Design a protein around this ligand. Structure first.
Ligand SMILES: Cc1cc2nc3c(=O)[nH]c(=O)nc-3n(C[C@H](O)[C@H](O)[C@H](O)COP(=O)(O)O)c2cc1C
Lengths: 94, 835, 141, 353
């Protein structure tokens, strides 16, 4: 596939996904499963004014990914921009 | 065992020969360096005189015999590229190298059912025969016994997997820069290691021939100048740029005003003497910053000159533009660990595995002749040991997580010495932690010092959806961060110019009411922008075009946005404010260098739009706020609202865990579907948030009331099951129907109504409006600004909660959830697109 | 509990001549009772108790016949716990002798006592929640 | 070079290198054989007649080699041939097992977490105490469900009913330890007010001082190499040459009546099969001499705890120390000639009959 054709296809797909996003349900269960189990995400960064999605990811981890986390020793560090700025910025308190 | 090491004799009546024999060789056959001295009895004070003629050639020949396994030929152009022999990585070789350097990482140790990686330091083993061949040519003359390895560095190219056992690696060495300094001759070699045609990594190596050299005709220097940024504020800047011959543009009529130019120049200088260049060339692409923060080539720097004292292009760029430093230091350094390594008693284990048979590391007599304090150990060994420690501690014993590693050998290291290495995390570069180290010896003398670019842990960025907006959002970052300032200011300027309101002011003050005035030409333009705002919906095959702000006409002098408590909670302003503060937080992170290149990303609701504008830069700040504001305002007309501005739709947050342990996602979906179908109204799950612990159901306020009542009933109690559930549904619905349409959803024991939401978004109700919304999104999102590399493998859409991939399976997945004619056309014509 | 048994052992050590009757009783015994199982504390502390010959081990809390007391007399009660045989020196019968002719318990109280069907050892802890076996746990002052 | 290490303690290697199995296996063999030699010489016995006095012999994993060696010993003249057999077997199993599964640097994040959780350094062997075999097995299975085949963990040493050892990758055992910590109560949790059934189970898990995961799938590929190496540097144990029963580590069966090669069976016991120490402890004996390492922390006290109250006295033949409880003997009890040397452990079924 040529780069220009690839760009056109990706633009059409992204357009269609955004267009149907507001008309279709949000599959955040599948999204969390994907980025926690398929990618084994070690640090989650939540860009938001409150730790909403961060608390959601934490809840998914306590509910589902506990034995998985223990067995594969995944230090899942869930950080939210509003409260975990120091951790995200690497500015530990001396 | 005892073998001859030196043979002193007379070849003739005058020539004393000292054959210094190295027995540690590639093939095991001893190699003798003959040192000749004239013996003049007439000069009785100093009868013995070194024979300089051919001395460097003889030293080079012996070193070639030791290092290179090709016929001796020094007559070849240093400019010409050196091709090393194809090398095959073997388990034995990786085993020996790891146990010679002290690499105890499990990645390099064979394990069952797992491929064995090779250390990054193995690249010097692969490419020694070319990197060291670089310094051999007769043009680059110098005493190899007096060679000093100044520094060595590794850089994995992005997207290249680490070396693994079994792969065939080719090495291509080039002399980046050879310069005659007063204290010696510096030679910089760049060896590209490639695998299966693709490049894998680059190995930089600096060598120093100590001595006096004046052969400037053979010296050259190629330097990648730092990237320079220049903001064109006035026509004076444009005139100054156009006065420069080297500044050339493909489009001579390109409008440079109010544009940021980035210059990526490389300077190649050939020297006439120590000070003056014989020829100076400076070439590179000039690119402009697009609204999407994307740098696209619009011109070239092309400077060429003969004898000159400097490069005027770099001087001009330094004086006028600003240097863009990719590395970003943290507020304070972060110590990691101070570690103790030990240099081995002997250097043969590293010499035989790395192929570096330099006698100064294994032979006492050669080191004595080289005037070294002893049989000093390989600096490359010390670099490999420090990198082992760094990948153990900074990278947590993850080989792949180490992408860059440079080191400078400031001092010699003797065997059986304790090396104390302090590791510090000092900065970030393109999402890779920059780690400094400073290895000192027992005498507290620095002997190694360098950098290491260590990838961060696997990062995902999840961008929050609507709900959490509050006054003062992102304003501390607006005060502190310059990138956040730029994002917010671009957004505010666009909003003022288009709709005559300040999103910054709305975020800061949360006004209850906001009156836009349409006086003067600017007010008329804003009024036209408001009147052009339409809500288009293809219902039953007919394209209805409702008008948002039906009040506004040619005679409207003002419009007023109303709110009960604050306008920041209105979707029109809540969504742009949230999207902007998210984009500002991410932009400040990117300015700090905290975004991994391979980091994945997802977004809840608008959160998706913010994530796209953040990680992929598909749309600029202006287009982002335009799209998001349009969506928020179309929400105001998407549902028939009463004369009080309240609609008969909303959302509840259901918790299957608080109704009963039995209640699962399947059970809740079954109950919701039966409620909707049996009662006839609209209701469905819109957000699958947490497994059996958090969900959102959107639909009619009345229907959601019945859902809450039915789940409350199931909390209070424990085909035929379908009929029983239908009875419960009927009870709740006949209880709820009589209520007035603008009802208030009560909190259930498990259902939490969401305040401030009156439209059932992410639901089947707004399907008729997808196509016109799709067209509006196409108008706002340009194809050229979509970057497949930035999106693929990292974006997880909400529609298809899988990694973004431009693949036929993915496109079919899109139809599997929501059918659309362009997708079917694409799948049908896919064999045509692929070709 | 274990701490109390250790204290009794310390007393026996301090007075190795004087005889000490360690009257072990599990939580399943009548009247005031503890939360400890009748068996596992003994499986844990029997060897320490028998390291002092002046301690005499008496088992109580749930014995009312010779049939259910013989296994503890011979020590074969431990063989079903996968321990060596653990003979016991004596036994005490508190709740069995409550309906005896010479106790001053009223006739109707004796009838109420006899009406209690009782439960095996493994389900005595249910008295903390429901009237298990006609008997329930209550909290004193 | 052990003579130099012994003569000059200053230049002895570090404890980790000494603990590495290619050192530890032959050297633990030397220690056990030295204890046996000291006992026999000080009692004025040849090794053969000391063995004849012994009713039986056995060993915990590694010690089985020494058990078979001293079982085959006949006299001082031919004692060094059995020493050579034992030491060669131990050296080769150590070398081949280290080659099959060497030791790699664990992530310092894992090391720091283990240290700050009041745990020792992770090792390929993790001992768990106060947990039933079924409970340890369900934890192991839960961890193995997520781990891949090459990184599995399995029970290695069934030391007792409430004492087990799980062998596998140190990282995998650290993951199991994370799960166990999640399922473990604090030691200082006063549960006296909670009903016995409702009490959260409490147990103690600590990593053993070992350098390789013995009795694991990981060292299985070493077994054939060890067998071939023994056939090359010939070390064969014959049932006819062995003249006392040697109790198997896996099933407790005597090695004499085994049809297959005793050396091969021993190697499988050390590297592949687990140690069911209770199943080996079915022999009827009144006195058990523990020649292993550790002294009070060695195999002797563990066997005493397993066999306590059955009338079996354990004597730690390798250490001179005083046991305040006097529930197990020490090196002096073997050589004592008065009635003090003859100590019979209490048998509850008899003494309190
Ligand atoms: C009515 C009654 C009164 C008791 N009073 C005392 C007492 O005063 N002091 C005491 O230490 N134990 C007392 N106990 C407990 C018993 O003496 C004995 O320790 C044991 O718990 C009885 O077990 P059993 O009911 O299963 O036979 C009493 C038990 C009963 C049933």
């Amino acid at each position: 596939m040529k780069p220009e054709v690839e760009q056109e296809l990706a633009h059409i797909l992204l357009t269609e996904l955004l267009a149907y996003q507001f008309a279709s349900p949000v599959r955040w269960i599948e999204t969390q499963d994907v980025f926690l189990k398929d990618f084994n995400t070690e640090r989650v960064v939540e860009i938001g004014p409150s730790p909403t999605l961060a608390g959601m990811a934490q809840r998914t981890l306590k509910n589902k990914y506990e034995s998985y986390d223990a067995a594969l020793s995944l230090h899942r560090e869930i950080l939210c921009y509003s409260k975990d700025a120091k951790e995200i910025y690497y500015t530990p308190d001396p | 065992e005892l073998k001859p090491t030196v043979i002193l004799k007379l070849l003739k009546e005058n020539i004393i020969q000292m054959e210094m024999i190295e027995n540690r060789t590639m093939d095991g056959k001893p190699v003798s360096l003959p040192l000749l001295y004239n013996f003049n009895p007439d000069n009785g004070f100093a009868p013995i005189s070194e024979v300089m003629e051919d001395r460097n050639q003889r030293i080079k020949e012996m070193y070639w015999k030791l290092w290179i396994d090709e016929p001796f030929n020094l007559d070849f152009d240093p400019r010409d590229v050196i091709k090393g022999k194809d090398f095959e990585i073997t388990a034995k070789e990786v085993y020996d190298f790891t146990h010679a350097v002290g690499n105890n990482c499990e990645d390099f140790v064979s394990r069952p059912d797992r491929t064995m990686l090779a250390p990054m330091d193995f690249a010097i083993v692969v490419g020694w025969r070319a990197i060291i061949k670089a310094i051999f040519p007769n043009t680059v003359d110098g005493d190899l016994l007096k060679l000093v390895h100044l520094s060595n560095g590794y850089k994995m190219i992005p997207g290249a997997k680490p070396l693994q056992v079994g792969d065939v690696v080719s090495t291509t060495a080039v002399i980046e820069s050879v310069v005659n300094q007063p204290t010696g001759k510096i030679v910089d070699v760049v060896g590209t290691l490639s695998r299966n045609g693709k490049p894998v990594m680059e190995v930089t190596s600096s060598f120093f021939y100590r001595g006096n050299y004046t052969d400037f005709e053979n010296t050259f220097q190629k330097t990648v100048e730092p990237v320079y940024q220049m903001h064109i504020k006035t026509s004076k800047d444009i005139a100054v740029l156009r006065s420069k011959e080297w500044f050339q543009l493909d489009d001579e009529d390109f409008d440079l005003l109010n544009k940021t130019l980035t210059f990526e120049t490389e300077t190649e200088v050939t020297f006439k003497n120590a000070n003056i260049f014989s020829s100076v060339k400076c070439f590179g692409p000039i690119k402009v910053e697009l609204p999407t923060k994307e740098t696209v080539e619009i011109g070239i720097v092309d400077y060429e000159a003969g004898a000159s004292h400097g490069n005027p292009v770099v001087d001009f760029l330094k004086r006028n533009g600003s240097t863009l430093e990719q590395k970003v230091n943290l507020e304070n350094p972060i110590p990691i660990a101070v570690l103790d390594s030990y240099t081995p008693s002997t250097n043969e284990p590293y010499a035989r595995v790395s192929g570096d048979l330099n006698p100064i590391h294994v032979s006492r007599h050669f080191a004595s002749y080289a005037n070294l304090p002893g049989t000093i150990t390989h600096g490359m060994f010390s670099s490999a040991s420090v990198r082992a420690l760094i990948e153990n501690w900074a990278a947590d014993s993850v080989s792949s997580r180490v992408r860059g590693y440079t080191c400078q050998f400031v001092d010699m290291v003797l065997p059986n010495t304790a090396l104390k290495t302090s590791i510090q995390h000092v900065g970030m570069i393109n999402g890779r932690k920059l780690i400094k180290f400073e290895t000192r010896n027992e005498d507290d003398v620095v002997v190694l010092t360098g950098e290491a670019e260590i990838e961060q842990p696997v990062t995902t960025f999840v961008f929050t959806g609507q709900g959490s907006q509050e006054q003062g959002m992102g304003m501390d970052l607006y005060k502190t961060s310059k990138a956040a300032q730029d994002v917010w200011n671009r957004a505010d300027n666009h909003f003022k110019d288009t709709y005559g309101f300040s999103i910054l002011d709305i975020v800061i003050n949360n006004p209850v009411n906001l009156t836009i005035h349409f006086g003067g030409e600017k007010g008329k333009r804003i009024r036209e922008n408001y009147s052009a705002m339409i809500f288009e919906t293809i219902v039953d095959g007919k394209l209805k075009t409702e008008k948002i702000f039906k009040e506004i006409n040619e005679h409207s002098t003002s419009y007023t946005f109303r709110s009960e408590k604050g306008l920041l909670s209105a979707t029109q302003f809540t969504q742009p404010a949230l999207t902007l503060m998210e984009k500002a937080a991410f932009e400040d992170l990117k300015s700090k260098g905290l975004i991994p290149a391979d980091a994945t990303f997802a977004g809840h609701s608008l959160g998706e739009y913010a994530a796209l504008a953040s990680l992929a830069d598909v749309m600029s700040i202006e287009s982002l706020v335009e799209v998001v504001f349009y969506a928020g305002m179309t929400m105001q007309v998407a549902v028939p609202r009463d004369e009080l501005g309240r609609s008969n739709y909303g959302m509840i947050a259901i918790n299957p865990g608080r109704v009963a342990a039995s209640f699962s996602q399947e059970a809740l979906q079954y109950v919701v579907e039966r409620v909707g179908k049996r009662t006839g109204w609209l209701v469905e799950i819109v957000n699958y948030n947490v497994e059996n612990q958090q969900y959102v159901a959107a639909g009619d306020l009345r229907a959601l009331d019945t859902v809450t009542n039915v789940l409350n009933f199931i909390k209070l109690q424990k085909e035929e099951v379908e009929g029983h559930l239908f009875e419960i549904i009927d009870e709740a619905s006949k209880k709820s129907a009589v209520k007035p349409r603008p009802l208030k959803l009560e909190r259930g024991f498990a259902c939490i109504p969401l305040v401030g939401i009156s439209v059932p978004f992410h639901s089947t109700y707004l399907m008729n409006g997808v196509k016109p919304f799709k067209s509006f999104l196409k108008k706002n999102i340009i194809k050229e600004n979509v970057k497949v590399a930035r999106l693929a493998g990292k974006y997880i859409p909400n529609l298809t909660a899988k990694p973004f991939q431009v693949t036929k399976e993915y496109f079919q997945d899109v139809y599997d959830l929501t059918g659309s004619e362009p997708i079917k056309e694409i799948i049908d014509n896919w064999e045509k697109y692929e070709q | 509990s274990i701490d109390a048994i250790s204290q009794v052992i310390n007393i026996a050590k301090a007075h190795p001549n004087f005889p000490i009757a360690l009257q072990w009783t599990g939580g399943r015994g009548g009247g005031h009772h503890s939360f400890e199982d009748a068996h596992t504390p003994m499986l844990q502390m029997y060897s320490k108790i028998r390291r002092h010959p002046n301690i005499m081990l008496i088992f109580g809390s749930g014995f009312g016949s010779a049939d259910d007391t013989y296994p503890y007399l011979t020590g074969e009660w431990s063989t079903k716990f996968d321990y060596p045989p653990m003979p016991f020196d004596g036994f005490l019968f508190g709740s069995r002798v409550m309906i005896a002719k010479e106790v001053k318990t009223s006739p109707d109280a004796k009838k109420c006592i006899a009406a209690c069907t009782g439960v095996p050892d493994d389900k005595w802890e249910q008295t903390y929640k429901k009237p298990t076996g006609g008997i329930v746990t209550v909290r004193s002052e | 070079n052990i003579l130099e290490w012994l003569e000059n303690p200053s230049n002895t290697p570090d404890k980790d290198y000494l603990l590495s199995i290619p050192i530890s296996c032959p050297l633990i063999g030397v220690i056990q054989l030295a204890h046996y030699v000291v006992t026999a010489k000080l009692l004025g016995f040849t090794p053969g007649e000391l063995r004849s006095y012994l009713k039986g012999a056995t060993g915990h994993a590694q010690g089985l080699v020494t058990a078979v060696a001293i079982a085959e010993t006949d006299s001082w003249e031919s004692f060094f041939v059995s020493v050579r057999k034992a030491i060669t077997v131990l050296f080769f199993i150590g070398v081949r097992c280290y080659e099959a599964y060497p030791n790699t640097s664990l992530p310092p994040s894992i090391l720091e977490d283990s240290l700050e959780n009041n745990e020792g350094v992770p090792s390929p062997m993790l001992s768990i105490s106060n947990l039933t075999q079924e409970q340890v097995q369900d934890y192991v299975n839960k961890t193995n469900s997520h781990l891949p085949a090459g990184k599995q963990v399995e029970i290695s040493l069934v030391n007792g009913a409430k004492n087990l050892v799980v062998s596998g990758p140190p990282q995998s055992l650290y993951g199991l330890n994370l799960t166990l910590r999640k399922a473990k109560a604090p030691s200082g949790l006063d549960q006296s007010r909670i009903p016995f059934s409702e009490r959260k189970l409490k147990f103690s898990n600590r990593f053993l001082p070992v350098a390789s995961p013995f009795h694991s799938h990981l060292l299985v590929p070493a077994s054939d190499l060890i067998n071939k190496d023994l056939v090359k540097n010939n070390v064969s144990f014959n049932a006819k040459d062995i003249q006392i029963p040697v109790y198997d580590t896996f099933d407790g069966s005597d090695l004499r009546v085994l049809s297959g090669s005793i050396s091969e069976r021993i190697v499988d016991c050390i590297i592949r099969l687990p140690v069911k120490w209770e199943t080996t402890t079915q022999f009827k004996a009144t006195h058990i001499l523990d020649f292993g390492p550790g002294g009070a922390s060695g195999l002797g006290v563990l066997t005493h705890r397993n066999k306590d109250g059955t009338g079996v006295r354990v004597i730690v033949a390798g250490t001179l120390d005083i046991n305040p409880d006097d529930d197990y003997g020490f090196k002096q009890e073997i050589f004592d000639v008065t009635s003090n040397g003859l100590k019979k452990n209490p048998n509850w079924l008899e003494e309190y009959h």
